[PDB]
Structure 1
Amino acid sequence: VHFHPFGNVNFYEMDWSLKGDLWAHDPVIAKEGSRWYVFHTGSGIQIKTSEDGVHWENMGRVFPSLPDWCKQYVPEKDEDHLWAPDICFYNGIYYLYYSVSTFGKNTSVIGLATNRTLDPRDPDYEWKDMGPVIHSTASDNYNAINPNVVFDQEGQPWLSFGSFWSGIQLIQLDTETMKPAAQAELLTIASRGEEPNAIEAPFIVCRNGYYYLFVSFDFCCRGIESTYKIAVGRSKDITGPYVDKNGVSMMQGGGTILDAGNDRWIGPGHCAVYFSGVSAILVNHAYDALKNGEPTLQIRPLYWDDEGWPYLLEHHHH
């Protein structure tokens, strides 16, 4: 399943000196035609576009206003900022997942919107509100935010999500609804194993016979004091057990650190990983120490070593 398509594009041949409107947190990317799209956290889900992948402009948003049903799930929410979108392309349809929540609480719902095209100029454009996907309340020990969809080796879709509480959750989706399958059960597949369980934002990819689970550790959303980092583990089965490069279980704080940030780019996290041919990129945000800690889009080539583990090189100089 080519659920994140990018064409003949070779990410290792592009110079990723990003320009333009770069302010963002919790970014994902998609490409339709020759146009690239970044979906990120903000009013009604915020959208940027680019004709090359490198020069970005703010383009629009997914919802003019919050869908009405959301209030039932999160009655205390009184603004229209939707969090941590995820995008995938399946059966000719775009499935956009997003989070409705309030900060520090686990009364939350993940919604689904669908579209035939990502382009508002295209007369087929219409984000159909397909309603709720999965939710959490105070009686749950997980938080229904931060969705991610992955396809397993048998082409079955799966949803991972989570933030704090018991950690990262996983549940099988139905291929028709792209919502959790009838009697499907929620599994916890990662956790720091203790309090406060600062693990969130899962992103799963399948490469060379392993599922790789990327996550963010520690604390976002504090500008220049954010302590966010990007960590990774892997499993032969999508249901786990996920283990880091040192063999430590990701259900016990395991995870190899991919990026902990530098003197400029503080607290990198909420990442997404995409492939095109034999190339890959990591997408995330980081808090800009030279611009008042403002969350900033980052896109970098991501390499894989001979043992199958991902790694980043030093930042180029521009």
Structure 2
Amino acid sequence: QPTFRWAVVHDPSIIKVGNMYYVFGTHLQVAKSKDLMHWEQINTSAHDKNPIIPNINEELKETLSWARTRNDIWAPQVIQLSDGRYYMYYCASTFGSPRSAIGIAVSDDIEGPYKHYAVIVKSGQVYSVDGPSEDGTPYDSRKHPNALDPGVFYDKEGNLWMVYGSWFGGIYILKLDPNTGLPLPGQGYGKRLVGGNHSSMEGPYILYSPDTDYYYLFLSFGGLDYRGGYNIRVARSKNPNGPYYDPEGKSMENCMGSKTVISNYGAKLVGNFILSESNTIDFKAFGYVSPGHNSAYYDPETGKYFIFFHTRFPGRGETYQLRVHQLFLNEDGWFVMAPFPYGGETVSKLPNEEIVGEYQFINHGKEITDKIKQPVRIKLNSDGSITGAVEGRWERKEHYITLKIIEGNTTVIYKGVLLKQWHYSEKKWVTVFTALSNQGVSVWGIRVE
């Protein structure tokens, strides 16, 4: 019987230190958990007297100076580097301002205190005063990134890379020197991977999967607010520095434009939804609004993958919390997200008896939208048919499920996983599935039991 206690961490970056998992996020929100379920809140704001960075205003005067803010840093990620020490990549900025910088702070202990190390990327240079951008040319917030949202990771060859960006000129990758954690010289902003021209995307994170030998790029498309339609998107590459491709085979290098256009690309993992049969705001029902800015983790001791993200909730406005879901790999080597938060579940072959039945069916679609999707009712029947709200065919091999679902003029194939999970609102073990189509659409099914 899982129980949970969540923490308030916005833009949470996962790091394992010992037998403890730690998330760091915006406003210096920090919390730790042994079990991924019960979180202990360790810091809540970047007030003068916080313990992670005391007197941050003086400690990080270089970045905060640059970004004209105080008593804040956004999007921190702590990584342990090869010297043994903890390196917190962070950014400082102001709301929707291209005036920002990625900095680094450093500590021998995970929980701090962190001190000033480097400022490594800057944006919003006003040529007359500051001279040019990082690439030696005049800054221009259409084609250059906003220096925010560092995602740092090692490649399977021990090279070190930072992916970063938010809106503005897009998402870029810089190769880093593993001994120092600073960018190698003369790459400027790096190589563009996604976006450009004020595309609505931020929060890049690249996780390497030893199970598929691909790098996955995860992004957040849209507004973080209650009405912003924040959703999580995935792409993948053989290479850490791309190019990244979505499940259709489009290149993420081509992903740029209005919200309408960029919604076409990527695999949308999740967006707004509520498991209520009565309305779009039902506090007894499980639901999220604007889930995203995630990170990810591969636990090599168990073989499981997790995603760490923030979310708002239907009817609850801006209030948010940390959530942790298991991610699974489907037959085609794409991630699908467990419908409910992680409850110690470990996939396994289910017999028919546990698969056949009536389901609540959520099709998260492809749009950047603030709409709170609600389920329909489908049936997985013993003869392999699907009926009710949709028509089609299902089949499974082991834990891998395939649904062939008639949708207008066409048959859409979704491929995913089947498993028992804990029903977060219903407090009981149910069968669920989670599958993904080639056009990048995610469907979750929760059996009605």
What residue is the counterpart of 1:40 in the other structure?
25
- Residues 86, 147 of structure 1: 8 Å contact kept: yes
Residues 288 and 206 of structure 1: CA distance in aligned 2, closer, same or farther (over 3 Å): same
Structure 1 residue identity aligned to 2:238: K
1-structure distance, mates of 2:145, 2:34: 39
What SS does the aligned partner of 1:294 have? Answer: coil
2-structure distance, mates of 1:293, 1:107: 25
Q: Shift in Å at residue 88 of structure 1?
A: 1.5
What residue is the counterpart of 1:261 in the other structure?
272
Which among 223, 229, 232 is matched to residue 231 of structure 2?
229
Which among 140, 146, 155 is matched to residue 158 of structure 2?
155
Structure 2 counterparts to residues 1-318 of structure 1, below 5 A: 18-20=4-6, 22-42=7-27, 45-60=28-43, 61=50, 62-64=52-54, 65-66=56-57, 67-74=60-67, 76-77=68-69, 79-91=70-82, 92-119=84-111, 126-138=113-125, 139-140=139-140, 141-185=144-188, 186-191=190-195, 196-207=198-209, 208-220=212-224, 222=225, 224-253=226-255, 254-263=265-274, 264-277=287-300, 278-315=303-340, 316-318=422-424
2-structure distance, mates of 1:94, 1:244: 33
2-structure distance, mates of 1:29, 1:286: 16
Give unpaired runs (5+ residues) of structure 1: 1-13, 120-124
2-structure distance, mates of 1:71, 1:25: 19
Structure 2 residue identity aligned to 1:217: F
Residues 219 and 182 of structure 1: CA distance in aligned 2, closer, same or farther (over 3 Å): same
* Count of aligned pairs: 290
Higher relative contact order, structure no. (Cα contacts within 8 Å, ≥ 6 residues apart): 1
- Residues 39, 47 of structure 1: 8 Å contact kept: yes
Which range moves more in the overlay, 290-299 or 240-249?
290-299
Which range moves more in the overlay, 46-55 or 293-302?
46-55
Structure 2 residue identity aligned to 1:86: Q
The normalised TM-score by structure 2 is 0.61
Q: Shift in Å at residue 225 of structure 1?
A: 1.1
Deviation string for 1:164-206 (max 9, x for gaps)?
1121010100112201012234111112x6x540011100012
- Residues 229, 259 of structure 1: 8 Å contact kept: yes
Q: CA RMSD in A?
A: 1.9
Q: Shift in Å at residue 290 of structure 1?
A: 4.6
Find runs of 4+ consecutive structure 1 residues off by over 6 angstroms: none
Give unpaired runs (5+ residues) of structure 2: 44-49, 126-138, 256-264, 275-286, 341-421, 425-449
Structure 1 residue identity aligned to 2:310: H
| Amino-acid identity (%) | 30
2-structure distance, mates of 1:218, 1:71: 26
Task: Mark the structure with the bigger radius of gyration.
Answer: 2
The normalised TM-score by structure 1 is 0.85
